[PDB]
Amino acid sequence: SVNTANANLSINTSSTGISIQSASTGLTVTSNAGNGQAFQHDQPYLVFRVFVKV
Amino acid sequence: HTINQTPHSHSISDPGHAHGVPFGAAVDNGNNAFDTGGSPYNNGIGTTQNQTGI
Secondary structure, eight states: OBOOOOOOEEEEOOOOOOOOOOOOOOOOOOOOOOOOOOOOOOOOOOOOOOOOOO | OEEEEOOOOOOBOOOOOOOOOOOBOSSSSSSSSBOOOSSOOOOOOOOOOOOOOO
C-alpha cells in the first residue's frame, strides 16, 4: 500500500490589480457668513443754531 | 497567484509476501520436479532476483 503524503507546495505572493477612479466630494455651496446690521455713518458737519424771524 | 511547489514522494507500506513452489516430485525419475524429504533445514537456497511489476 501507499501511505498518505503531502504535496509540499506554497503560494507566491502577488499584488492585486486594484485602482480607484474619480469621485466628487458632493458639496456645492458654503455656509452663510454674514449678518445684515445697521451701520452708523456721518458726513463731516458743523453745528449751528437757527432762529426764525417772528 | 503563482504556486511554489516542490516534488513530493510517498512512503510505501510493504507487508511481507511469500510465493509458493508446487514442484514436489512423487517419482524419482526425470528432472521435472524436486524429490521430497523429511526434516527441513536451511541449506542456503534462495530464489532468483526479479522486479515485481507494479
